[PDB]
Amino acid sequence: IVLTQSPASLAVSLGQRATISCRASKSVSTSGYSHIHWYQQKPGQPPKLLIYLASILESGVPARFSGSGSGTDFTLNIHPVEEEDAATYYCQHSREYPLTFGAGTELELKRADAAPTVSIFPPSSEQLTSGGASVVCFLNNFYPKDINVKWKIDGSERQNGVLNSWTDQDSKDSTYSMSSTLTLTKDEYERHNSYTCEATHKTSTSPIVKSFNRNEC
Amino acid sequence: VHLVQSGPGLVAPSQSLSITCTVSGFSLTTYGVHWFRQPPGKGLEWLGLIWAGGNTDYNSALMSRLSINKDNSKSQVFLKMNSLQADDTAMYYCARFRFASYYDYAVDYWGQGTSVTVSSAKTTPPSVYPLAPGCGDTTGSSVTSGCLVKGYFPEPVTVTWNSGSLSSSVHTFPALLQSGLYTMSSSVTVPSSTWPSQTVTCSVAHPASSTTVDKKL
Numbered sequence: 001i002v003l004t005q006s007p008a009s010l011a012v013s014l015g016q017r018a019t020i021s022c023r024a025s026k027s028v029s030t031s032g033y034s035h036i037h038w039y040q041q042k043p044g045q046p047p048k049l050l051i052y053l054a055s056i057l058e059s060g061v062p063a064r065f066s067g068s069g070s071g072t073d074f075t076l077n078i079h080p081v082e083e084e085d086a087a088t089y090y091c092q093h094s095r096e097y098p099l100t101f102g103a104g105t106e107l108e109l110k111r112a113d114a115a116p117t118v119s120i121f122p123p124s125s126e127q128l129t130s131g132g133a134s135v136v137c138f139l140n141n142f143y144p145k146d147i148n149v150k151w152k153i154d155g156s157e158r159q160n161g162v163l164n165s166w167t168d169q170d171s172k173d174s175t176y177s178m179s180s181t182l183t184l185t186k187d188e189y190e191r192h193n194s195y196t197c198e199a200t201h202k203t204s205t206s207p208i209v210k211s212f213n214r215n216e217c
Numbered sequence: 218v219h220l221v222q223s224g225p226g227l228v229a230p231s232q233s234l235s236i237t238c239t240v241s242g243f244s245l246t247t248y249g250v251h252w253f254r255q256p257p258g259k260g261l262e263w264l265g266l267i268w269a270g271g272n273t274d275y276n277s278a279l280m281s282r283l284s285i286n287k288d289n290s291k292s293q294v295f296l297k298m299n300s301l302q303a304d305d306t307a308m309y310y311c312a313r314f315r316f317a318s319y320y321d322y323a324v325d326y327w328g329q330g331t332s333v334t335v336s337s338a339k340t341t342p343p344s345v346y347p348l349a350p351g352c353g354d355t356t357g358s359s360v361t362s363g364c365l366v367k368g369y370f371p372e373p374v375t376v377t378w379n380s381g382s383l384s385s386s387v388h389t390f391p392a393l394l395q396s397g398l399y400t401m402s403s404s405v406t407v408p409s410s411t412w413p414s415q416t417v418t419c420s421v422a423h424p425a426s427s428t429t430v431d432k433k434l
């Protein structure tokens with residue numbers, strides 16, 4: 001068969017209800033049993049079974065998860081969506097072989113805006129020994145996700161050779177964190193002074209700034 | 218460990234793969250084992266099932282290229298995949314099949330997975346560089362520290378703080394393929410005490426190369 005999940009992404013504030021759908025190409029229902037399953041794959045773990053045979057709950061998964069449906073149309077309800085469910089959701093039929101999955105519906109929990117705590121790091125001694133220099137900035141615990149960092153080197157000289165990586169949504173508080181690595185050669189790190197990490201995020205017109213001066217080289 | 222698979226790392230194209238799934242807390246005498254894989258960033262995919270009585274069902278597609286076989290006494294299922302292509306790069310998971318009757322079954326427990334990268338390249342160990350606030354500011358009551366892990370191949374890597382004791386305020390920034398190699402980083406925030414003379418450490422274990430280096434900050 002082939003399973004179609006909508007929405008592909010979803011954001012719902014706490015206490016709300018979220019409704020993942022899943023429609024099949026064919027009636028995955030033989031007699032009164034809808035052969036479909038629902039899995040929660042948190043950010044970087046294996047899948048956790050939530051519901052089997054469309055409605056039955058897996059022991060342990062809390063009762064705010066509900067599965068409903070017949071034939072072609074199926075639905076997972078999560079209410080109240082608590083911070084802990086910021087994960088990706090799959091449905092799988094087992095009506096026939098092969099056992100196909102639907103594409104995944106990501107849930108993103110809406111939350112109040114939170115501004116970043118920027119941190120700036122020199123390169124290690126060990127790195128410079130390999131002839132290279134990395135300057136690292138952790139922009140941590142902000143919401144929403146959209147942030148754009150800039151590297152200012154020595155004067156309002158900007159740079160390229162930047163690596164930027166975002167963590168997925170934290171399951172305790174619904175924040176994001178970011179890592180930005182400017183990677184220079186030692187032999188050019190060495191002949192400059194100021195390195196700024198200037199972050200610009202919704203919570204202020206003013207970019208946040210962290211910066212260090214190469215201190216006794 | 219309830220289900221754990223080993224098989225791993227880098228396997229060059231056209232060669233064969235065997236991932237061994239070791240079950241615990243049940244026996245193959247009574248339980249089926251599915252194999253699934255997840256190709257990086259996209260959907261989960263079913264490979265096949267070996268039922269209780271050593272019986273097998275395969276995803277007609279991969280069909281020709283794989284076999285699954287159990288040694289009931291040893292509590293291991295083994296998946297043999299031959300003529301590896303580069304899109305078989307995937308996370309490989311083994312899962313338990315609780316079957317009671319056609320109206321009550323579940324794919325209920327999942328293995329952690331193992332990462333298999335099909336490519337003609339050679340593994341490359343990471344370089345680990347500690348990142349500590351170096352220009353002295355009276356860092357409040359919390360300080361951030363980081364570990365930068367650079368240039369490894371293939372994935373995965375595991376970065377733990379003081380061997381696993383601190384996994385409180387640990388952020389793990391996902392990995393970025395840069396020029397054929399991966400880089401990643403993790404930050405931890407500890408109190409302004411639990412840093413200086415408490416001595417922090419990230420322990421990076423890069424399986425494929427059998428690197429397990431601990432860098433002291």
Ligand SMILES: C[C@@H]1O[C@@H](O[C@H]2C[C@@H](O)[C@]3(CO)[C@H]4[C@H](O)C[C@]5(C)[C@@H](C6=CC(=O)OC6)CC[C@]5(O)[C@@H]4CC[C@]3(O)C2)[C@H](O)[C@H](O)[C@H]1O
Nearest residue numbers: 030031035094095096097099266314316318319322323324
């Ligand atoms: C009593 C019996 O029950 C119904 O038939 C059943 C047998 C057969 O038809 C199938 C479809 O092929 C079987 C199939 O064989 C094995 C499975 C693929 C297997 C797996 C799940 C998983 O995850 O891994 C493997 C467990 C159930 C399964 O999912 C399906 C369920 C749909 C069903 O339709 C149900 C009818 O009522 C029938 O007429 C009557 O004989």
Ligand SMILES: [Cu+2]
Nearest residue numbers: 001002025100
């Ligand atoms: Cu089809």
